Design a protein around this motif. Structure first.
Motif, mmCIF file in Angstrom:
data_model
loop_
_atom_site.group_PDB
_atom_site.id
_atom_site.type_symbol
_atom_site.label_atom_id
_atom_site.label_comp_id
_atom_site.label_asym_id
_atom_site.label_seq_id
_atom_site.Cartn_x
_atom_site.Cartn_y
_atom_site.Cartn_z
ATOM 1 N N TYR A 35 0.578 -1.127 -0.032
ATOM 2 C CA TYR A 35 0.065 0.062 -0.127
ATOM 3 C C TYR A 35 0.795 1.196 -0.073
ATOM 4 O O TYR A 35 1.856 1.423 0.859
ATOM 5 C CB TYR A 35 -0.907 -0.062 1.401
ATOM 6 N N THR A 36 0.492 2.261 -1.073
ATOM 7 C CA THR A 36 1.243 3.544 -1.049
ATOM 8 C C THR A 36 0.181 4.459 -1.547
ATOM 9 O O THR A 36 -0.636 4.019 -2.174
ATOM 10 C CB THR A 36 2.430 3.257 -1.887
ATOM 11 N N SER A 37 0.887 5.827 -1.319
ATOM 12 C CA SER A 37 -0.002 6.986 -1.859
ATOM 13 C C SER A 37 0.521 7.210 -3.280
ATOM 14 O O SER A 37 1.280 6.549 -3.708
ATOM 15 C CB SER A 37 0.165 8.073 -0.934
ATOM 16 N N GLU A 38 -0.047 8.465 -3.820
ATOM 17 C CA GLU A 38 0.541 9.152 -5.031
ATOM 18 C C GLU A 38 1.421 9.966 -5.071
ATOM 19 O O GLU A 38 2.261 10.439 -5.999
ATOM 20 C CB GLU A 38 -0.618 9.215 -6.130
ATOM 21 N N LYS A 39 1.530 10.962 -3.906
ATOM 22 C CA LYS A 39 2.308 12.179 -3.727
ATOM 23 C C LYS A 39 3.788 11.395 -3.684
ATOM 24 O O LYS A 39 4.685 12.195 -4.207
ATOM 25 C CB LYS A 39 2.014 12.775 -2.473
ATOM 26 N N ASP A 40 4.022 10.500 -2.752
ATOM 27 C CA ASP A 40 5.289 9.909 -2.799
ATOM 28 C C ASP A 40 6.027 8.853 -3.759
ATOM 29 O O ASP A 40 7.171 8.779 -3.859
ATOM 30 C CB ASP A 40 5.209 9.400 -1.168
ATOM 31 N N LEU A 41 4.941 8.596 -4.663
ATOM 32 C CA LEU A 41 5.180 7.705 -5.620
ATOM 33 C C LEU A 41 5.508 8.632 -7.035
ATOM 34 O O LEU A 41 5.657 7.872 -8.040
ATOM 35 C CB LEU A 41 4.248 6.809 -6.071
ATOM 36 N N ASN A 42 5.613 9.983 -7.074
ATOM 37 C CA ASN A 42 5.640 10.666 -8.149
ATOM 38 C C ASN A 42 4.712 10.509 -9.227
ATOM 39 O O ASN A 42 5.083 9.921 -10.338
ATOM 40 C CB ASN A 42 7.223 10.435 -8.678
ATOM 41 N N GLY A 43 3.593 10.815 -8.769
ATOM 42 C CA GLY A 43 2.601 10.808 -9.441
ATOM 43 C C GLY A 43 1.655 11.747 -9.543
ATOM 44 O O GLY A 43 1.866 13.020 -9.072
ATOM 45 N N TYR A 87 -11.388 9.461 -10.055
ATOM 46 C CA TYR A 87 -10.805 9.120 -8.852
ATOM 47 C C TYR A 87 -9.695 9.830 -8.167
ATOM 48 O O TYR A 87 -9.123 10.684 -9.280
ATOM 49 C CB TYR A 87 -10.613 7.695 -9.089
ATOM 50 N N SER A 88 -9.435 9.662 -6.918
ATOM 51 C CA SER A 88 -8.315 10.170 -6.577
ATOM 52 C C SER A 88 -6.919 9.518 -6.835
ATOM 53 O O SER A 88 -6.907 8.484 -7.671
ATOM 54 C CB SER A 88 -8.446 10.371 -5.141
ATOM 55 N N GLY A 89 -5.841 9.752 -6.004
ATOM 56 C CA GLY A 89 -4.520 8.986 -6.454
ATOM 57 C C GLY A 89 -4.192 7.848 -5.769
ATOM 58 O O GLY A 89 -3.424 7.234 -6.034
ATOM 59 N N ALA A 90 -5.347 7.292 -5.045
ATOM 60 C CA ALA A 90 -5.222 6.003 -4.424
ATOM 61 C C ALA A 90 -5.215 5.054 -5.346
ATOM 62 O O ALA A 90 -6.007 5.030 -6.465
ATOM 63 C CB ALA A 90 -6.153 6.015 -3.052
#
Ligand SMILES: *[C@@H]1O[C@H](CO)[C@@H](O)[C@H](O)[C@H]1NC(C)=O
Ligand SMILES: *[C@@H]1O[C@H](CO)[C@@H](O)[C@H](O)[C@H]1NC(C)=O
Ligand SMILES: *[C@@H]1O[C@H](CO)[C@@H](O)[C@H](O)[C@H]1NC(C)=O
Lengths: 476, 21, 245, 98, 274, 75, 472
Positions: free
Chosen positions: G146-154, G164-167
């Motif tokens: 499980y990871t977010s999108e802000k920290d995954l360079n997205g 939809y959101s970045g999840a």
């Protein structure tokens, strides 16, 4: 008063229009279209053989004609009935088909003596004065002996290239495929279509007893003196045993009523041709009456002449082993249809003489009438440049484009360009520099510069007519 | 049945110029 | 150049023998293939050529063109084109001298006048039409005598005659088109029909100007899409016809 | 008016005087292109099918028993320019000539 | 004639399908094939949105009842001369079309319980042609109703002064447009009859009268073919084409432009003056 | 908007392609849109109709198909 | 006097337009529109397998979708060499594709009392308040993290049927076919996705070594809770490696000159605002200048954003086994189109300013003031009827026509009918009645009424302006 006369003049016209509408409905059914479509698709769409992909419409060589005449033709003609030969198990092939050709003689033209050392023979274009009449080949039967047009009971045809005669060397095919194929093979083995031939005709007819309505077929292949093959076709759904059903008696009664009506109109027009006014040609509503009467009289004359002589059908029915001759009947049917369509169109146009019942229609009619003179004046000037452009296109492009081949085609293609249908990509290769210059200047000038003049004239005339009509009403 | 346009054009021009004159 | 033999079996033999040597396979800018097709029935010739272009070593571009013409030599006598192409020169000289008799008569500053320029385009067109036909006749005669000189072994490339016979026919059609336009212009003498031409004359300047303005702003159809020209034409025609009456 | 009419007559004689072979030229050219299989000759795009092409549809035409009177043997030409080039990068051709 | 038909379920996506393949043998020989496919969904109970759509339907019925009661209580006021407004003879069309739609929908959904009891695939042919037929009429009725209700926004939108000017321009010239359209259609029908008589049996674009009318409309649009017209009749065919093109694109079409233009100018001038 | 899904058009087009575009047999090219004779209709009856009806597209038949004929009388 | 203000300004505007045209001459190729159309058209050509030919639009049922999934679904990018995988030696095996999918959770609502035992998987529409991070399946690898999108360079999704959101979860391909095929086969053995997915986006970055320019391909798939899925695909010519030769330096110099000119114009306007008439909007002609200033500001902001993205993207290409991250500078083609539009607008403004030298050839084409708006009253009443016809056609047709499948292209079909492209080969048998009626009542009301009134509305304006000019 002024209302009792117009009421009678309108009710008689409505009765005549109803009679004419019933008559024209009775002659135009829905089965004939499908009948013709099946015939054409059977004879003009099937390829020559299983391997070749060329049909009759795409004939390109004299060898392809020989390939077609044995194969698709014989497949279409003779069907093995589960003897006679029913085309679709419904259409009966009555009689036997006939094939004939027209040819010219060697030495018809004159090769120059400068190059006479290499050219041995020539054959000019087809002409009545320069057509062959001598026997050739094995010399047994009618396929190798010239037969006069009078003895063949034929007539001219007016083909694409020229107007062919009715004479030539003919041969009547057999009633079964096993003998027709042998006859065609015999005609092919010996050289029967050499360089001297100019045309070839194939014709027959069918009955289709399910609906009492004949169908005559004619296929024409033209061999121009410059080489190539030009095919043509014609299917005509005749009807020669009309009086069978009650609807047919009703149609005959309607025809009699129409004859009475046209007699009454010609009487009532020759009555007022001098009494009410002598030499009245400034109305345009009486110049139409004489056109109606003349067209209707010609139509009845053609109808009474065509159906009065049907001795060919009877003499065929006496012995059904000979070729029926139905060309003239089909020609006269085509002429009768052409006359009747124009007659009914003018009859429908005649309706405008009565739609003046209120002020809105009267002012529109006045606007249309008052703007005819200047529109006619400008039409001459417009058409002068139109025909100048047409002749320029015919002279420059009229030899390598296939679309400007003749003057009529140039007129029609310019009319289509006015509609914005025809693309411009087929002219630059025809001529690199003058092609797009022609297209651009023509569209620029005729498309809006000389085209909106009609709209401007109509708008100005209508506005001023309406203004004058409003002004005179308030002045009163 | 071949048609020669020379005489047709000449006669047409003569008739047209007569009409305008 | 290769002569492609003289006989049917000779043609095949030459083709195979010369083809096993790869003479046009590597660079081969173009090849070309042209031949003549005289027809005696209608008395017409035909210059047929088949071009095949290799722009990039691998893919080849091909095209063809067939130009039919009527070979008529100048030395044939006094044929109709010769007669009609010398009096055209006389008409051109007459027009030129008539315009020169006006140039000096009025003095100078005869520029920016359409009548002073439309009478020189006509002279140039008539002169070109007269000269191109003579050039075509001379070229045809030269080519024919060259061919007859070496008939069993020469080729003589009749394509130039076909080119000239089309240029002359184009010029002759353009001149007739101009004459028809002049005849259309001469229709204004009717009292009630003089309005159209002069309304067009007063309407063309601003119309061309605004069309140029629109095309500069942008080849989409805006003008003839629905209507604008009728708007100006109606106003000018109404005003001018009101002045006339 | 007389001068204008005379000039119109002259130009009509010059232009339409021989306007009876105009149709025949069209028929002739249409016959020639269709016989040579113009659509088939334009279809070829490689430098090897040219030989079977002109070995089965051109030789019977030019050389035959009667075969459409010729008046002159055909010719073949060439240009090579002596500044031999190299194949271009793949994809669409450089349609500007180099 | 020969009819072949069956029914299809496709358990993957809940969409029924009733088919009908027709092959006709005319008396002149040949075969004329035809077909029709019609998907059906008669569950309507799959998620939370089923009750949402049921509530939407019942509130739509409430709106229709309100509109019809409003109209009938308006009939309690001036009865005649009520139809010369074009915004009151249309609202009755709205309510009658919507009532017909509601009735056809309730009739269609009334006979549905027989549809479910064939998933067992018993040995009996189901007669499913009525359900397919009633799914075609409902779509057309709904389309016409939504079209007219979208059109009925003009009576609200014309309170803008420019919108009011355009509406006045339209209303003040309708009589002239109808009067001239009568003449236009007389000429149109004359030409259509001419074409039908001439090219009746050869072109397939003039097979029947209505086809002739549609072909002429396409000609006006600029979709002529002309490849078969010339060969069907070398003469009197091109004559028809040229005369039709000239009379339509040169004379008849510009009359509408003249009427609209001078009516608009007169209306705006009078409005500004008053 | 609610009463108009997107599956109906795709499903109809797929059924049309299954039953009308496939050839009658692996030896000729006459699909259902180009019938020309009674023999072709019979070939279709034993041909593409059976293949598309009792498929190995993944739809399931309910009930049972029926074939019907209309005809006229002699004379 | 009274002539410098109409000559110097016109000359300056013409020079600015010429500079903008010169800058845009070497900005994008002339076949950009054709290339974009070809890319958009050929984005749905995925076959099924060697057994079945169920394409994207032919795989909706069980076995059709099974055949579509099992096959060349992931073999399009990787091709066997004559490791590396280059289709035409232009896009070598340099990087891997990425896939992003967003899902939601069910059970966020209470079922009805009557259907308590009937409705259990009752899930409403996905939203921000319906985000879940519950993983399912056996934990064996790192693919279920499980990871977010802000920290995954997205970034976000911006879908069609569901924004939809970045999840969600992300998946990356390999640099060779040997491992990619094995991974795909292993994944296809068991289930790979659920029915709760809201938005799916596949992003692919290609080097395209033939021509130095970044290429990005985006394919969107969104499934709503009301039924139906709206698929779409597009491509964008991202600009991140534009520094090749002196042309890049020339473009940078042109951008700097444009920025300096914009700054000078803003300074002049400010100096002519506080000491002159300010807060004035009753001119109806200065709005053009305001729009020009806004367009210049937008172009400057676009250039600044592009420079920032290029600076941020300079940290990539650290290793030779990763993919180029281009999910932050995918607004290059749109920026170029906006720049071209701004240049066209500047040229138009220069032409309008310099046309005053025309005596009467341009005075009749200046009727904007007389026609201030004066025309939206026709556009609105035209578009209402257009939408009414579009709705009617989409309802009565849309099942057996193959054309009127969805609204956005029904608009295009009616536009093509107006332009002249008429089919009329499927309407007639789709419905024998009400089919021809639609076509006739559409052509009659379009070609005889509305398009005929839009001529009069400008005719009367021209006549009125001419009358004013004559009377003055
Ligand atoms: C026709 O006559 C010419 C003149 O002698 C001759 O050369 C040619 O062979 C003849 N044609 C036939 C078919 O005999
Ligand atoms: C012509 O007649 C002869 C004599 O009867 C006969 O032998 C021959 O078969 C017939 N046909 C041909 C082509 O010679
Ligand atoms: C031609 O003349 C009459 C037709 O009235 C007929 O008796 C005769 O048999 C016809 N001849 C042929 C060869 O058809």
């Amino acid at each position: 008063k002024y209302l009792k006369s117009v009421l009678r003049e309108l009710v008689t016209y409505l009765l005549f229009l109803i009679v004419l509408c019933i008559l024209t409905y009775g002659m135009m059914s829905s089965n004939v279209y499908y009948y013709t479509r099946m015939m054409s698709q059977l004879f003009l769409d099937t390829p020559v053989s299983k391997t070749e992909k060329t049909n009759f419409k795409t004939l390109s060589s004299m060898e392809d004609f020989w390939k077609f005449t044995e194969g698709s033709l014989l497949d279409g003609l003779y069907w093995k009935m589960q003897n006679r030969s029913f085309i679709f198990y419904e259409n009966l092939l009555l009689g036997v088909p006939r094939i004939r050709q027209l040819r010219v003689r060697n030495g018809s033209c004159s090769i120059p003596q400068d190059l006479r050392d290499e050219i041995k023979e020539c054959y000019d274009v087809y002409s009545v004065s320069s057509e062959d009449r001598a026997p050739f080949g094995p010399r047994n039967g009618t396929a190798w002996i010239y037969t006069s047009e009078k003895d063949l009971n034929g007539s001219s045809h007016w083909g694409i290239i020229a107007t062919y005669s009715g004479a030539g060397y003919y041969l009547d095919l057999s009633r079964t495929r096993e003998e027709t194929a042998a006859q065609v093979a015999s005609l092919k083995k010996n050289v029967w279509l050499d360089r001297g031939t100019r045309a070839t005709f194939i014709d027959f007819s069918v009955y289709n007893a399910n609906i009492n309505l004949f169908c005559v077929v004619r296929l024409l292949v033209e061999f121009p003196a410059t080489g190539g093959v030009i095919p043509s076709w014609q299917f005509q759904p005749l009807k020669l045993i009309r009086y069978v059903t009650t609807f047919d008696f009703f149609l005959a009664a309607c025809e009699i009523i129409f004859c009475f009506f046209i007699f009454y109109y010609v009487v009532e027009e020759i009555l007022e041709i001098r009494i009410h006014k002598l030499h009245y040609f400034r109305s345009f509503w009486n110049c139409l009456d004489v056109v109606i009467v003349v067209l209707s009289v010609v139509a009845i004359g053609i109808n009474i002449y065509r159906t009065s002589n049907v001795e060919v059908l009877l003499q065929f029915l006496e012995d059904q082993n000979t070729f029926p001759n139905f060309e003239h009947l089909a020609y006269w049917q085509i002429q009768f249809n052409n006359i009747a369509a124009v007659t009914v169109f003018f009859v429908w146009i005649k309706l405008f003489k009565f739609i003046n019942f209120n002020r809105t229609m009267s002012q529109l009619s006045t606007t249309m009438s008052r703007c005819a003179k200047d529109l006619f004046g400008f039409a001459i000037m417009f058409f002068i440049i139109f025909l100048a452009y047409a002749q320029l296109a015919y002279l420059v492009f009229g030899t390598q484009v296939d679309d400007f081949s003749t003057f009529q085609e140039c007129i029609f293609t310019q009319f289509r360009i006015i509609l914005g249908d025809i693309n411009f990509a087929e002219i630059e290769e025809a001529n690199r520099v003058l092609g797009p210059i022609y297209f651009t200047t023509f569209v620029f000038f005729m498309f809006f510069i000389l085209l909106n003049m009609f709209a401007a004239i109509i708008a100005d005339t209508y506005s001023e007519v309406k203004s004058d009509l409003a002004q005179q009403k308030a002045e009163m | 049945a071949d048609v020669n346009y020379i005489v047709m054009l000449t006669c047409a021009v003569c008739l047209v110029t007569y009409m305008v004159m | 150049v290769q002569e492609l033999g003289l006989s049917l079996e000779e043609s095949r033999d030459r083709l195979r023998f010369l083809q096993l040597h790869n003479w046009l396979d590597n660079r081969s800018r173009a090849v070309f293939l042209e031949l003549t097709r005289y027809s005696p029935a209608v008395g017409l010739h035909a210059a047929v050529t088949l071009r095949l272009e290799f722009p990039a070593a691998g893919r080849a571009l091909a095209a063809l063109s067939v130009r039919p013409f009527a070979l008529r030599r100048l030395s044939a006598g006094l044929s109709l084109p010769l007669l009609t192409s010398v009096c055209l020169l006389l008409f051109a000289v007459h027009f030129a001298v008539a315009e020169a008799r006006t140039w000096h008569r009025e003095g100078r500053w005869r520029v920016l006048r359409l009548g002073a320029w439309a009478r020189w385009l006509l002279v140039a067109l008539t002169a070109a039409t007269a000269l191109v036909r003579l050039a075509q006749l001379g070229a045809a005669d030269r080519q024919w005598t060259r061919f007859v000189r070496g008939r069993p072994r020469r080729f003589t490339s009749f394509d130039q005659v076909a080119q000239l016979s089309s240029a002359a026919r184009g010029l002759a059609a353009s001149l007739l088109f101009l004459l028809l336009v002049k005849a259309a212009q001469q229709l204004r003498f009717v009292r009630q029909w003089s309005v159209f031409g002069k309304t067009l004359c007063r309407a063309l300047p601003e119309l061309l100007g605004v069309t140029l303005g629109l095309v500069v702003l942008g080849a989409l159809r805006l003008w003839g899409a629905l209507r604008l020209g009728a708007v100006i034409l109606r106003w000018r025609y109404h005003a001018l016809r009101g002045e006339l009456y | 008016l007389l001068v204008y009419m005379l000039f119109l007559l002259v130009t009509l004689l010059a232009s339409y005087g021989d306007a009876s072979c105009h149709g025949h030229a069209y028929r002739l050219q249409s016959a020639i292109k269709q016989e040579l299989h113009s659509r088939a000759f334009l279809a070829i795009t490689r430098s090897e099918e040219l030989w079977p092409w002109m070995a089965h549809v051109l030789l019977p035409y030019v050389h035959g028993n009667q075969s459409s009177p010729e008046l002159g043997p055909p010719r073949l030409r060439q240009v090579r320019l002596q500044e031999a080039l190299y194949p271009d990068p793949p994809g669409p051709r450089v349609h500007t000539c180099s």
